[PDB]
């Protein structure tokens, strides 16, 4: 009786993972970006009429692949992103990568749910994980705060759209400090648990439903 | 009168001649065994050889073989008619035959071996154990016995309880070193003797020389049925 | 590239706790080098006639825990038992878990998937071996023991793993061993060999080469041949097989 | 190795069988001195008994003789061919012949019986000499042994000096009683007693037991060539 | 009548210093019991091939004197010598001085004129000797005598003696003795049997029957076998002869 | 050694003896007879022309004959006494006698020899053993007696008769006394000798001659 699966573990050896962001970018994606990964990339959010995607790999190491572009293309670049690899299944094919396609998502104002925020997540829905944020949020008072949370999720079991979960939302102080006073990440920021369950703690989850959930989406799809 | 004192040293000129044709499943000391049996050493093979005194004309197994001995026993009958005689045989005076050490049953590859050589004269027998236990050593002993059973012919063996106690643990298991330390097997797990129980080593090499009389029956029943059969 | 840039916040351990955790050992033996014997001696605990005949179990372990089937399997005599037997669980395994996974998917549900072989040979100085283990060359993952360990001295352990070393490349074959690695790379070369109840000739019984094969084959570089297993015999099992098809 | 002492005790079950056939002058206690070589007792007469053991085929003159041995060579070797066998010979193991004490050299009798006889197996013989001297005695051994000599076939005998003495003093007399006072003959004039030298009475005795291997001559030589002669 | 008148003055001596005498002795018997040894023994003194020969010998002795032809004569074996032989000498002898006496006389010049045979026989337990004897019943003067006496017991000579005589008679033969005679007549009857140097088995060597022989035989009943033999042999000699020519 | 023949005097046990007389018979034949043989018998000499023999045995037995018969006739007498006995030799013949013939002749006077004497002796020569004696011999002075002894001797030594010998004559006194003087027997009388020579000292050579001589005379002169 010796039954470690500690093997398991000195396995990797990697882990590797993809990452994607719509938004309005005038307004802390690329922080997110850079902040969320506590790291410094320039020049990654100016684009022309109409996409722009990362990745890195650094280490501790993962590829982590951010995607982000400024409906239908980030559709038909995901899906030929997805097409693309179990397409490779089919083949005699050598072990390629790669697959993580989940949302982080912005759209924040705020009152309402934001009307290409609405339509951008609908259709988007199966085709990766969703995470949905609310981002320069040091804009709001959160007795204020109080009602984008209420409204936008009101909005999103009536207007009926899929998430992720693990087993709120997500609020995104892009730490930095004011004239007056200093915003803090948080607690302050619900920005910390953007990091606790998206960092370590439910990240292969995310992957691994996004590689189970559509793949078999997108083949099981077109197997028809 | 006297004459068994005689008798006795009348083998002293002529004493005395041995055949006997190993088959086993090499493996297990067939070989190594022997020359142990015998204090000395070496698709058929033969063996001629002698000691302090007596002749070996000794054949090993390395069924073309039945051909072999019914050649020797067409040797034998030829010259009996009869015209000469100075003259010899190589008439087979006893088999071995050699079941494994380990896994159990008996092989049906031995039973049809065992079946249909038998008129000549074997001792079956086990090499290597010091694989067995007392335990496991039984444990073949009989299911081996039965497995004669369903079935068997080798040799019945024709110092009262010197016969009755030798035969009774028949068959019985045996390893020659021709190595030493007291032969004869090395062991750092623990050290392994002949000629002890222990080793029922001794019980073939003191029963076989004891009797060598399988002269005896291989010359009364053996070839005088293969004139038998064969003349008739 | 250079994704070399530079920086807090464990993604390998979460797929630690991707505990439910399957394997398959079968060995391959005459009736009978104890590979039962070998089974329940190597987990501590209790699991002559014609044709190649295949022996099929499955059990289950702990301390967080493991699904595991054990097959072992008997042959024996008069010779062509093992082109044939073994084809029988091992391609036809094998096809299959192609087979659910060509057609809805990923139910996380095999073993046979196949996975090791212990081939165990017997021990002592062979042929049916030879092509049972080089048309056993396929593979499985053939680990490669030699049975009732205390037939042998010391002097002809030395003798006869090294001598039937040069038999296994002689017509070489296929084999297994692992690349970390000075202590999975010495117990590779350490063809290996095997020997009851306590307590602590005349037999007292067991150092050995016992643990060697324990803790390696059962222990340590463990998943190795599942994936060996995934990749090769899928592997030559689909692209052979779609060689053919296709 | 040890089969001496095996062989030794084997005759135990099966010793051992003589038969012989007496010739000679009566006269002269051919029946009188058997009985006391035998310690018991009694154109052709037969004796087969058996003591402590041995059994005796014994056959006693009182030349149609010479059919009787070659019928007997006759059904050794009818039945040697072949077929089936338990079973028997009465063949000749040996036979003595006995010239006279008295009166000189040796009869025209005896040699023309002592010719024509002789495959199967003599011994000669003097018996009473308690007539006869030692210069007599040895008188009559010698030409005897030249009158064999013109000519001859009995059969000369295959414990260094044991043997070698016995065989000088050939041929050897001797007086048979049964009765005594020890054995055992009387003179009011003098007695005369068995066993001494005084007697040549027990270099019969002691030979004739010692050896009994015309088992064995007349077995390899008189019947062989009674083949080799008469099949061919 | 009655010539019976009474009255001085031997004629009887005058035929006494009939001093020149003369006897013939004969042994017949197998090459040899001692015939020869016989002899010399009696006086004190020395003298197997084919067919009857009869050997021939005279001597001449003293104290006061005598001529004495000895004959012995010899036999073996293959088995009518003895009809052939013996009818050589002694009818032959016999009518010879017949035949001097028919003719001038009276020349007081013989012997053979045969006069006695031993027949001697030898000892143990026969019939060559019967009819030897039986047709030697004729005669000549036949004693009947038995030869190496040391070789057997006295209990058997109670046994072979008086069973042997049972034999003259059995057919009955012809014999001699004598008719005074107490010790003549004592000593016919007491078949008999007979013996060397000395002073004074192992043998020594003499009481044992060679006197009895000795003393009648040679000493006492002396000429009676003479005139017996001339009696007798000449007797039925001439007469059957006659008988025969006339 | 023992070479006796003390047998041969056991042996007769009979001894016998023929023995004749011729004289005148006045004087003492008849005497010498019965003296001769101290013995008395009557009645033996008295006869018819022309003769008369007494056998006795008397015992101490001989059978002595004597014959005395008062030329031819005792010629042809002894004889046929002669071819008798070897007429029975000739036969299958049973042991038979009688065979001595010798003379006691007397003829006794004295001067000269008797001329019947002469005669008597001179043809009986042959036919037995003749000894002749002198009778009556008190008849004569012996100085006298000188030569009756030389006469006849010188008688018959010329007219050439034989006698006996046994290696004189014989003069024989018929003791007898008379008127002056008694004469003996002797010496004396030579009476004596033919006591002595006859009786028992040469008696056997004079029947064995008798036998010898006279048988062989009569028969092997009568075979031719
Ligand atoms: N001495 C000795 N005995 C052994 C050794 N290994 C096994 N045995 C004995 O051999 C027997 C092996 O029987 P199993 O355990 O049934 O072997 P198996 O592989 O199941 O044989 P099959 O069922 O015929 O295929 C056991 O009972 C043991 O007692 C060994 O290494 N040394
Ligand atoms: N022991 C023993 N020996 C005897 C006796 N009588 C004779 N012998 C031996 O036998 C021999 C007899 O030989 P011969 O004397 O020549 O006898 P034979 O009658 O002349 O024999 P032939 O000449 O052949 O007729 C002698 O040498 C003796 O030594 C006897 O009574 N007892
Ligand atoms: N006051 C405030 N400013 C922010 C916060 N987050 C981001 N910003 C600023 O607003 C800008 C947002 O643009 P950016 O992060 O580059 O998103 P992009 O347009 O997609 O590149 C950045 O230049 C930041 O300097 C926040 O939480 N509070
Ligand atoms: N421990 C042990 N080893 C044995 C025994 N018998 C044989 N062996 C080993 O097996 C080998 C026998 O080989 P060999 O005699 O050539 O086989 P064979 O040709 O069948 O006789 C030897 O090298 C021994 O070391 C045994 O009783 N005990
Ligand atoms: N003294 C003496 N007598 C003997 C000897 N051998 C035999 N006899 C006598 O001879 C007789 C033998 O007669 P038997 O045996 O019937 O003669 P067979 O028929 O020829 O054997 C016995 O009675 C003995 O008394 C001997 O060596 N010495
Ligand atoms: N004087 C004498 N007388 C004699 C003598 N001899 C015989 N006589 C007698 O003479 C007689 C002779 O006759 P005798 O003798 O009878 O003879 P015979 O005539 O033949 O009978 C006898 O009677 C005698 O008595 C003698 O010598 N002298």
Same mark, same amino acid.
């Given at each position: 009786?010796?039954?470690?699966?500690?093997?398991?573990?000195?396995?990797?050896?990697?882990?590797?993972?993809?990452?994607?962001?719509?938004?309005?970018?005038?307004?802390?994606?690329?922080?997110?970006?850079?902040?969320?990964?506590?790291?410094?990339?320039?020049?990654?959010?100016?684009?022309?009429?109409?996409?722009?995607?990362?990745?890195?790999?650094?280490?501790?190491?993962?590829?982590?692949?951010?995607?982000?572009?400024?409906?239908?293309?980030?559709?038909?670049?995901?899906?030929?992103?997805?097409?693309?690899?179990?397409?490779?299944?089919?083949?005699?094919?050598?072990?390629?990568?790669?697959?993580?396609?989940?949302?982080?998502?912005?759209?924040?104002?705020?009152?309402?749910?934001?009307?290409?925020?609405?339509?951008?997540?609908?259709?988007?829905?199966?085709?990766?994980?969703?995470?949905?944020?609310?981002?320069?949020?040091?804009?709001?008072?959160?007795?204020?705060?109080?009602?984008?949370?209420?409204?936008?999720?009101?909005?999103?079991?009536?207007?009926?759209?899929?998430?992720?979960?693990?087993?709120?939302?997500?609020?995104?102080?892009?730490?930095?400090?004011?004239?007056?006073?200093?915003?803090?990440?948080?607690?302050?920021?619900?920005?910390?648990?953007?990091?606790?369950?998206?960092?370590?703690?439910?990240?292969?989850?995310?992957?691994?439903?996004?590689?189970?959930?559509?793949?078999?989406?997108?083949?099981?799809?077109?197997?028809? | 009168?006297?004459?068994?004192?005689?008798?006795?040293?009348?083998?002293?000129?002529?004493?005395?001649?041995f055949?006997l044709?190993?088959?086993?499943?090499?493996?297990?000391?067939?070989?190594?065994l022997?020359?142990?049996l015998?204090?000395?050493?070496?698709?058929?093979?033969?063996?001629?050889?002698?000691?302090?005194?007596?002749?070996?004309?000794?054949?090993?197994?390395?069924?073309?073989?039945?051909?072999?001995?019914?050649?020797?026993?067409?040797?034998?009958?030829?010259?009996?008619?009869?015209? @000469?005689?100075?003259?010899?045989?190589?008439?087979?005076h006893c088999?071995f035959?050699?079941?494994?050490?380990?896994?159990?049953?008996?092989?049906?590859?031995?039973?049809?071996?065992?079946?249909?050589?038998?008129?000549?004269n074997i001792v079956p027998v086990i090499?290597?154990?010091?694989?067995?236990?007392?335990?496991?050593?039984?444990?073949?002993?009989?299911?081996?016995?039965?497995?004669?059973?369903?079935?068997?012919?080798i040799y019945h063996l024709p110092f009262?309880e010197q016969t009755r106690l030798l035969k009774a643990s028949i068959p019985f298991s045996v390893?020659?070193? @021709?190595?030493?330390?007291?032969?004869?097997?090395?062991?750092?797990?623990?050290?392994?003797?002949?000629e @002890?129980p222990?080793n029922d080593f001794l019980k073939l090499r003191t029963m076989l020389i004891t009797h060598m009389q399988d002269l005896?029956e291989?010359?009364?029943?053996?070839?005088?049925?293969?004139?038998?059969?064969?003349?008739? | 590239?250079?994704?070399?840039?530079?920086?807090?916040?464990?993604?390998?351990?979460?797929?630690?706790?991707?505990?439910?955790?399957?394997?398959?050992?079968?060995?391959?033996?005459?009736?009978?080098?104890?590979?039962?014997?070998?089974?329940?001696?190597?987990?501590?605990?209790?699991?002559?006639?014609?044709?190649?005949?295949?022996?099929?179990?499955?059990?289950?372990?702990?301390?967080?825990?493991?699904?595991?089937?054990?097959?072992?399997?008997?042959?024996?005599?008069?010779?062509?038992?093992?082109?044939? =037997?073994?084809?029988?669980?091992?391609?036809?395994?094998?096809?299959?878990?192609?087979?659910?996974?060509?057609?809805?998917?990923?139910?996380?549900?095999?073993?046979?998937?196949?996975?090791?072989?212990?081939?165990?040979?017997?021990?002592?100085?062979?042929?049916?071996?030879?092509?049972?283990?080089?048309?056993?060359?396929?593979?499985?993952?053939?680990?490669?023991?030699?049975?009732?360990?205390?037939?042998?001295?010391?002097?002809?352990?030395?003798?006869?793993?090294?001598?039937?070393?040069?038999?296994?490349?002689?017509?070489?074959?296929?084999? =297994?061993?692992?690349?970390?690695?000075?202590?999975?790379?010495?117990?590779?070369?350490?063809?290996?060999?095997?020997?009851?109840?306590?307590?602590?000739?005349?037999?007292?019984?067991?150092?050995?080469?016992?643990?060697?094969?324990?803790?390696?084959?059962?222990?340590?570089?463990?998943?190795?041949?599942?994936?060996?297993?995934?990749?090769?015999?899928?592997?030559?099992?689909?692209?052979?097989?779609?060689?053919?098809?296709?």
């Amino acid at each position: 009786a010796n039954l470690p699966n500690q093997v398991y573990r000195k396995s990797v050896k990697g882990f590797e993972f993809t990452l994607m962001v719509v938004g309005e970018s005038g307004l802390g994606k690329s922080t997110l970006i850079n902040s969320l990964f506590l790291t410094d990339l320039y020049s990654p959010e100016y684009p022309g009429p109409s996409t722009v995607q990362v990745e890195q790999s650094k280490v501790l190491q993962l590829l982590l692949t951010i995607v982000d572009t400024p409906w239908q293309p980030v559709i038909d670049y995901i899906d030929s992103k997805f097409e693309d690899y179990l397409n490779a299944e089919s083949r005699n094919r050598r072990q390629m990568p790669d697959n993580v396609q989940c949302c982080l998502y912005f759209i924040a104002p705020g009152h309402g749910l934001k009307p290409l925020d609405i339509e951008f997540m609908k259709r988007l829905h199966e085709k990766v994980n969703i995470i949905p944020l609310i981002a320069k949020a040091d804009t709001l008072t959160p007795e204020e705060c109080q009602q984008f949370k209420k409204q936008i999720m009101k909005e999103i079991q009536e207007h009926k759209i899929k998430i992720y979960e693990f087993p709120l939302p997500l609020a995104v102080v892009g730490g930095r400090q004011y004239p007056w006073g200093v915003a803090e990440v948080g607690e302050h920021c619900d920005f910390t648990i953007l990091r606790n369950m998206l960092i370590r703690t439910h990240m292969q989850d995310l992957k691994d439903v996004t590689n189970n959930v559509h793949y078999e989406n997108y083949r099981s799809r077109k197997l028809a | 009168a006297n004459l068994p004192n005689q008798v006795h040293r009348k083998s002293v000129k002529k004493g005395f001649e041995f055949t006997l044709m190993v088959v086993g499943e090499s493996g297990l000391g067939k070989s190594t065994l022997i020359n142990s049996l015998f204090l000395t050493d070496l698709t058929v093979q033969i063996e001629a050889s002698t000691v302090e005194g007596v002749k070996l004309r000794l054949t090993v197994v390395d069924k073309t073989i039945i051909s072999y001995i019914d050649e020797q026993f067409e040797r034998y009958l030829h010259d009996e008619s009869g015209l @000469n005689r100075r003259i010899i045989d190589n008439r087979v005076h006893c088999c071995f035959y050699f079941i494994s050490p380990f896994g159990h049953g008996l092989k049906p590859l031995d039973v049809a071996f065992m079946k249909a050589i038998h008129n000549v004269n074997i001792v079956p027998v086990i090499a290597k154990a010091d694989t067995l236990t007392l335990k496991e050593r039984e444990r073949l002993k009989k299911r081996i016995l039965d497995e004669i059973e369903e079935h068997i012919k080798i040799y019945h063996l024709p110092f009262k309880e010197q016969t009755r106690l030798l035969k009774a643990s028949i068959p019985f298991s045996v390893v020659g070193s @021709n190595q030493l330390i007291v032969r004869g097997r090395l062991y750092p797990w623990g050290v392994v003797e002949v000629e @002890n129980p222990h080793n029922d080593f001794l019980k073939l090499r003191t029963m076989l020389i004891t009797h060598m009389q399988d002269l005896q029956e291989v010359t009364q029943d053996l070839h005088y049925e293969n004139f038998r059969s064969e003349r008739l | 590239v250079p994704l070399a840039g530079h920086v807090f916040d464990p993604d390998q351990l979460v797929n630690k706790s991707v505990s439910g955790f399957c394997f398959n050992i079968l060995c391959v033996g005459e009736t009978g080098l104890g590979k039962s014997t070998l089974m329940d001696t190597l987990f501590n605990t209790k699991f002559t006639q014609p044709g190649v005949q295949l022996q099929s179990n499955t059990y289950d372990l702990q301390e967080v825990r493991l699904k595991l089937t054990i097959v072992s399997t008997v042959g024996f005599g008069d010779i062509n038992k093992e082109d044939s =037997y073994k084809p029988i669980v091992e391609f036809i395994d094998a096809q299959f878990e192609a087979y659910l996974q060509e057609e809805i998917r990923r139910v996380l549900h095999t073993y046979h998937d196949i996975h090791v072989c212990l081939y165990f040979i017997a021990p002592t100085g062979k042929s049916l071996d030879l092509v049972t283990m080089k048309k056993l060359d396929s593979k499985v993952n053939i680990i490669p023991i030699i049975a009732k360990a205390d037939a042998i001295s010391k002097s002809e352990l030395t003798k006869f793993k090294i001598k039937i070393t040069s038999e296994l490349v002689s017509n070489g074959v296929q084999i =297994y061993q692992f690349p970390v690695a000075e202590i999975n790379g010495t117990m590779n070369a350490h063809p290996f060999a095997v020997i009851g109840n306590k307590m602590m000739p005349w037999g007292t019984v067991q150092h050995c080469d016992f643990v060697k094969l324990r803790e390696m084959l059962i222990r340590v570089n463990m998943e190795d041949l599942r994936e060996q297993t995934h990749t090769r015999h899928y592997e030559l099992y689909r692209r052979c097989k779609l060689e053919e098809m296709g």
